Design a binder for this molecule. Structure first.
Ligand SMILES: [Zn+2]
Lengths: 203, 256, 202, 523, 175, 98
């Protein structure tokens, strides 16, 4: 893995995270590698003599990569904040052998956010409520991801015999043979495993 | 012919005019406006006169002195450009609609009492106040005729704009004058006539204000109601011995 | 990057518990008949002199109350469709959908029409079809109005659109202005958010 | 006295924090624009702060005396001893690029902080160091050296030279240098011969940059700046408003034809008839006139002017055409920027007035330029009306060797002339018109001292004076020294805040004694 | 995804510049920058080329596809096929805008290039509008948008997808 | 700012403080040493130094070099981008383009 391939993987993860309705799989290894490279390059730039153009080149590159990393992490944070209860419930019932969806820091942040929200709602309102009505189930109040949203994608590995609208026969053509390099407009529910396995890129 | 060259020059003006500097960016002004208006359903554009002068001074100078043919060529060029910008139109809208071009300029306005007889068939800019209007009648643009005896048909005849008719043929090509206009095979547009009165300050002392008849067509109808101050840009034209009534074919209105 | 992100309303037969717009849509009243009388609730009816609402009375209850008290047994409450959703208006909608004023008919047309499907009726397959065909027929004009309108007063174009169509219009207008600002080279300025400026106005 | 600029000025401040102080004048603004372009190209941090007078200069220096070490001053702080007033340190280095020729002797003979960027090849008579610093001979030299306040070379030309040495010169910098030179010409601060020499130099540079070639300047796209040399007319803004108003509101045509008088109007009508242009077209906007009338306008105008006693109706200047519609002349930019700098309706936020004036000089703020053009038209009309009113009613009295005129408070558009540059322009225009009108031979070679009600509350009147008009004047002004001596003699309360000593304030009470003492001193 | 981010993805293509300064090899995280020899071509990412041109330190060489004849051929091909056609670059509009706005004295015949790119863009946008209208009218569930660039998608995105989401919600409610 | 705080309840203020602490902890958790501040860098980068102009008096603004800058209305400084983005977004500075 050349560093260029690491940057390309970071870009692909950023773009895939931006257009996905749910919270995709964590990629903490890429984050840590990119952070380490940036940290080393900061000192490598600091040592260099002032007045050199290489300083400008390296500083511009660092500013160009830090933005992408921050945007990816910000998207993940927003998605965690919008759907904390369902994400936490899915994390509790996680089975071994399945890739994790949350880094430990994100898991702690989600726990703290849920605790803050529950404590605030309880203290402000629920205390003075009638005794019978004082329990609110956050698993049935906070919204859920809309896995039926339409997305744009570019195909990397060929897939054949893909079923469009599997639950209805109203569609005239129900079979799609995706080639390599083509782009399609289709629902997210149909092609979620393809995005998960890296065979399809959301652009 | 020179008509084709003039039409090509107008098309180039429409397709190549840009506004802005390289420090911010460039945006084509009339092509984008044509596309936007055609998609919205409004088939018209408002072409300034300083822009056309800056692009081609000769073209602007041929519009201030022979407005009829040059305006017709400009409208045809606008139609062709609008057709090419939105070439893949949705099903049912293959046929291209006609575009009406309105003019505007920042010149100092003239007076109604300053209109000489030399300035006939020239673009003029006169202010005033509207004091009358008429009901929106119909004016034909394309007509088809048919013989009464041998029922020969001569379709797609064009009628000049303004208060000008069409002399029907005598020979049948079946008595003399055997041709009648087919009612349903006629394309018509809106049509209105106004009366412009001289401004209350330009009137000399001890004299009643003068008037002037106006002509409005297509999207210019129902834009001004009596009692509005307007600035009119139009073509001075004619409709006792040798005396002819004179009106003003309005090609632009700026309600104040 | 929009700073404030309120909870989106839920289209279809299901609402969102935390949605403000869905909390106002259900407030709209719906014709109902009291199949079994409500004793000791006659104080609600100002005209009625008795302290108990009699059996068989008809009232325009809010949608949330009708949903709460409804039961398939139809022994506590029965629901009558509003006038806009009966056959008479459905045929008019089928005639041409771009001429009606879905802001005066009801500020939330699609949402309320979908919520009407919770109550069982023999006309639901027709109500759903009418709503779908209305949306399909009105989509194209909304798209053309939103995309091709630059630097022009839009109050005349959004005066006959309900809230869902108004949101679509906003999306189209913000998708056009971004490109136009990019081409003119005004997208390279670091600018404060709208919320900060609005706070500064105060 | 700085001999080299690529090594002693730029490289010293490349990796430091510069602080630019710019005086409010068009030449200073152009020099500042060129310096900012160079600094931004070389990644040099700087702080740009407006400076108006001596007091503001001192206060702003005190504010940032610790945060910065290297200081650069443009068109300010060169005719006085900056070291004594500011009291700087050894580390601080002051770079000064100012057009005032009577440089302070102390700053000339100093190598610690004052590194003057003023060119040493100018007409400057430097006194001997031993005579001044080593006694009546010293006073004689002092009086023979600091007698006048004639201006010098343009700062923008020096900035363009600095950019040229570094090979970082673009068309935008050449245009700013041209605008600075034309600003100097318009204010009438340089002689005609020096203006012609500078025009020749800038013409050489323009010919270098605009290397026209076949199929190279044809395939070259529009929207690229194209500066060209043009021997054009002597009319102000004649391409924006009508030709008639331009003729009636200029300075050469109005003074030569005596347009303030009815016989002048008749002569103007005869001139227009002789040219052969209908009165309708002449009164229309220049961009809407007939093409045929604009074919050979310059030649016919020159001929019909030659018949009517007008000779110098053609001047040498430059143009610019960056796109389809945009096209200006140097004097138009000068007038627009000057109007934006000095505004009375925008008296609020004077620093914002400076900001708008600076922003108008960029090719991305053309709307501000157009507003400046409109304001310049209004200013020209106002000064013409005021000159006509002053001449017709005989408000100018030959009080001894110098003429004295005072603007009444009730006089319309009097708030416009409280500003310095507007007052100077009014003074020059009024003097030229009066010289053209009057018949007394002695009065034709006399100076003018104009006044204006600067502040009503404190009873302060602003005063200005210009050198006597002549066919080939040296532009040398002695009014500052005489004003100072008369103020000391009368124990008057006068202020010299402005960087030009010829402009001072004065209380209403001290007016009469000051005037009488000035008459006695000039006798 | 705003247009600035789409530009940010188009500022990584490769262009050839002819520097005037001299510099040795630079080891960037994304690649190795070739030796900088005056009057010698060295390929650099577009952002570096733009910065160097703005700082007066290079001379941008126009890309191969930026020719009048090639662009006319592309425009004629686009106005001939019903569906979309392959483009000389996936970021042709951003490349054209940036290069023609920041370095026009080096590129010759810039005006005709800008006039032809605009025509191709207009035709492709009209085709995209037809595709959207046909998608909604037919109540389809899939569409094959081949050879379509990112900016053209960004023009109509966030409006097409939301409309399709609402249509799907209104389309399966009784189920 | 005190203006926004005046309209906030005490429990809401406690929630805000706890949210801020959790956010800071998450920021520090990222990577080694000081973490990557997600709040900054909210727009694609284009150049290192940007020309800015003050819009109000803000005392003096200090940089890591140990030297402050007197922020006075209608003054311009050619500072690097990464030091002024927060000030620009708050409304204390304005980005000046050529
Ligand atoms: Zn016949």
């Amino acid at each position: 893995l050349t560093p260029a391939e690491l940057i390309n993987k970071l870009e692909e993860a950023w773009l895939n995270e931006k257009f996905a309705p749910e919270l995709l799989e964590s990629k903490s290894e890429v984050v840590e590698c990119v952070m380490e490279q940036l940290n080393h390059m900061e000192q490598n730039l600091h040592r260099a003599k002032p007045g050199d153009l290489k300083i400008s080149f390296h500083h511009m590159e660092i500013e160009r990569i830090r933005y992408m990393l921050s945007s990816y992490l910000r998207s993940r944070m927003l998605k965690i904040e919008k759907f904390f209860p369902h994400i936490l419930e899915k994390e509790k019932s996680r089975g071994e052998g399945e890739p994790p969806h949350l880094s430990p820091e994100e898991f702690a942040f989600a726990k703290e956010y849920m605790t803050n929200t529950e404590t605030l709602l309880k203290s402000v309102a629920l205390r003075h409520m009638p005794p019978n009505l004082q329990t609110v189930d956050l698993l049935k109040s906070v919204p859920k991801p809309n896995l039926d949203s339409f997305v744009f994608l570019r195909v990397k590995e060929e897939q054949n015999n893909i079923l469009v609208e599997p639950e209805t026969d109203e569609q005239s053509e129900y079979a799609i043979d995706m080639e390599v390099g083509s782009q399609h407009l289709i629902r997210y529910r149909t092609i979620a495993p393809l995005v998960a396995s890296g065979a399809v890129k959301l652009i | 012919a020179k008509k084709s060259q003039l039409k090509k020059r107008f098309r180039e003006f429409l397709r190549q005019y840009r506004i802005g500097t390289d420090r911010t960016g460039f945006t084509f002004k009339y092509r984008d406006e044509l596309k936007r208006h055609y998609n919205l359903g409004e088939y018209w554009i408002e072409v300034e006169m300083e822009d056309l002068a800056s692009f081609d001074e000769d073209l602007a100078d041929y519009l201030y002195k022979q407005p009829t043919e040059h305006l017709q060529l400009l409208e045809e060029a606008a139609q062709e450009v609008a057709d090419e910008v939105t070439r893949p139109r949705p099903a049912g809208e293959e046929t291209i609609q006609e575009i009406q071009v309105m003019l505007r300029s920042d010149a100092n306005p003239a007076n109604i009492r300053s209109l000489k007889s030399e300035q006939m068939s020239h673009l003029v800019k006169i202010p005033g106040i509207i004091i009358a209007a008429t009901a929106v009648r119909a004016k034909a643009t394309k007509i088809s005729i048919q013989c009464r005896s041998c029922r020969n048909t001569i379709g797609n005849i064009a009628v000049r704009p303004g208060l000008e008719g069409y002399a029907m043929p005598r020979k049948c090509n079946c008595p003399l004058d055997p041709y009648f206009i087919i009612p349903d095979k006629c394309k018509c547009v809106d049509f209105q006539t106004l009366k412009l009165q001289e401004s209350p300050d330009a009137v000399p002392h001890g004299e009643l204000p003068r008037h002037m008849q106006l002509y409005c067509d297509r999207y210019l109808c129902d834009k001004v109601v009596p009692g509005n101050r307007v600035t009119i840009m139009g073509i001075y034209s004619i409709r006792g011995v040798g005396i002819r009534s004179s009106y003003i074919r309005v090609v632009g209105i700026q309600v104040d | 990057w929009e700073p404030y992100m309120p909870v989106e309303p839920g289209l279809g037969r299901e609402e969102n518990f935390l949605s403000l717009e869905d909390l106002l849509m259900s407030q709209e009243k719906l014709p109902c008949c009291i199949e079994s009388g409500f004793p000791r609730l006659g104080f609600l009816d100002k005209g009625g002199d008795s302290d108990s609402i009699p059996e068989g009375s008809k009232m325009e209850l809010p949608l949330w109350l009708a949903k709460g008290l409804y039961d398939n047994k139809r022994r506590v409450l029965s629901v009558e469709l509003p006038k806009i959703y009966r056959e008479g208006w459905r045929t008019v909608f089928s005639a041409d959908a771009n001429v009606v004023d879905l802001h005066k008919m009801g500020p939330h047309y699609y949402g309320f029409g979908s919520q009407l499907l919770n109550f069982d009726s023999p006309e639901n397959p027709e109500i759903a079809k009418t709503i779908l065909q209305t949306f399909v027929g009105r989509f194209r004009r909304i798209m053309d109005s939103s995309q091709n309108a630059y630097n022009e007063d839009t109050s005349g174009l959004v005066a006959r659109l309900d809230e869902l169509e108004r949101s679509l219009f906003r999306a189209g207008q913000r998708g056009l202005n971004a490109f136009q600002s990019w081409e003119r080279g005004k997208a390279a300025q670091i600018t404060a958010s709208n919320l900060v400026q609005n706070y500064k106005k105060r | 006295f700085v001999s080299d600029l690529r090594k002693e000025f730029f490289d010293v401040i490349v990796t430091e924090r510069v602080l630019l102080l710019v005086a409010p004048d068009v030449d200073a603004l152009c020099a500042c624009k060129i310096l900012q372009a160079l600094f931004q190209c070389d990644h040099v941090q700087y702080t740009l702060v407006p400076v108006s007078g001596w007091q503001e200069l001192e206060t702003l220096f005190l504010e940032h005396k610790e945060q910065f070490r290297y200081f650069v001053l443009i068109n300010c702080g060169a005719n006085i001893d900056l070291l004594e007033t500011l009291q700087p340190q050894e580390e601080a280095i002051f770079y000064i690029c100012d057009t005032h020729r009577p440089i302070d002797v102390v700053n000339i003979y100093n190598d610690s902080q004052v590194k003057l960027l003023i060119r040493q090849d100018d007409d400057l008579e430097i006194p001997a160091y031993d005579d001044i610093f080593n006694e009546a001979r010293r006073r004689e030299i002092i009086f023979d050296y600091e007698q006048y306040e004639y201006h010098g070379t343009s700062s923008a030309m020096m900035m363009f030279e600095l950019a040229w040495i570094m090979s970082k010169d673009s068309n935008d910098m050449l245009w700013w240098a041209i605008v600075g030179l034309t600003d100097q010409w318009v204010q009438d601060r340089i002689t005609q011969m020096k203006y012609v020499t500078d025009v020749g130099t800038l013409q050489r540079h323009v010919s270098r940059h605009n290397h026209r070639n076949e199929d190279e300047e044809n395939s070259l796209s529009i929207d690229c700046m194209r500066i060209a040399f043009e021997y054009d007319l002597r009319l102000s803004l004649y391409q924006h408003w009508s030709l008639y108003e331009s003729i009636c509101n200029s300075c050469y045509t109005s003074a030569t034809l005596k347009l303030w008088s009815l016989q002048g109007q008749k002569k103007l009508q005869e001139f227009l008839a002789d040219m052969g242009m209908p009165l309708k077209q002449v009164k229309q906007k220049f961009n809407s006139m007939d093409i045929s009338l604009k074919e050979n306008l310059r030649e016919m105008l020159e001929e019909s002017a030659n018949k009517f006693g007008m000779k110098d109706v053609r001047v040498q200047t430059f143009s610019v055409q960056f796109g389809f519609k945009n096209k200006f002349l140097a004097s138009d930019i000068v007038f627009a920027v000057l109007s934006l700098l000095e505004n009375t309706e925008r008296d609020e936020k004077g620093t914002d007035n400076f900001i708008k004036a600076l922003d108008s000089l960029s090719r991305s703020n053309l709307d501000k330029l157009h507003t400046g053009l409109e304001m310049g038209k209004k200013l020209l009309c106002a000064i013409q009306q005021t000159v006509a009113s002053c001449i017709c009613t005989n408000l100018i009295l030959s009080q001894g060797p110098f003429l004295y005129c005072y603007l009444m408070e009730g006089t319309p558009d009097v708030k416009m002339f409280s500003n310095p540059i507007s007052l100077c322009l009014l003074c020059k225009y009024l003097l030229k018109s009066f010289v053209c009108s009057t018949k007394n031979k002695r009065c034709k070679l006399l100076p003018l001292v104009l006044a204006a009600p600067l502040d009503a509350e404190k009873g302060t009147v602003i005063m200005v004076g210009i050198p006597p008009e002549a066919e080939s004047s040296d532009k040398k002004n002695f009014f500052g020294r005489a004003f100072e001596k008369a103020a000391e003699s009368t124990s008057s309360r006068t202020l010299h805040n402005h960087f030009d000593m010829s402009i001072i304030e004065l209380r209403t009470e001290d007016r009469s004694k000051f005037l009488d003492a000035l008459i006695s001193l000039l006798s | 995804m705003d247009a600035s981010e789409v530009e940010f993805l188009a500022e990584k293509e490769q262009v050839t510049v002819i520097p005037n300064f001299s510099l040795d090899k630079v080891y960037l995280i994304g690649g190795d920058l070739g030796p900088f020899n005056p009057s010698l071509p060295v390929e650099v990412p577009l952002w570096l080329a733009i910065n160097l041109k703005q700082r007066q330190k290079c001379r941008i060489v126009p890309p191969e596809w930026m020719d009048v004849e090639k662009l006319e051929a592309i425009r004629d091909q686009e106005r001939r096929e019903e569906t979309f056609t392959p483009m000389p670059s996936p970021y042709y509009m951003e490349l054209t805008k940036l290069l023609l706005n920041h370095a026009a004295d080096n590129i010759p015949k810039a005006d005709e290039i800008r006039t032809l790119v605009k025509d191709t863009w207009d035709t492709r946008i009209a085709k995209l509008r037809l595709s959207a209208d046909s998608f909604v009218k037919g109540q389809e569930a899939h569409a094959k948008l081949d050879n379509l660039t990112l900016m053209e998608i960004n023009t109509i995105g966030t409006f097409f997808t939301e409309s399709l989401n609402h249509m799907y919600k209104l389309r399966t409610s009784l189920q | 700012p005190s203006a926004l705080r005046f309209h906030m309840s005490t429990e809401e203020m406690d929630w805000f403080n706890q949210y801020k602490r959790s956010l800071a902890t998450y920021m520090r958790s990222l990577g080694g040493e000081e973490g990557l501040d997600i709040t900054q860098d909210m727009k694609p980068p284009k150049s290192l130094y940007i020309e800015v102009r003050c819009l109000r008096d803000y005392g003096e603004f200090e940089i890591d070099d140990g030297t402050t800058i007197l922020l006075k209305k209608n003054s311009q400084h050619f500072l690097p981008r990464w030091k002024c983005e927060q000030l620009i977004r708050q409304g204390v500075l304005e980005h000046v383009l050529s």
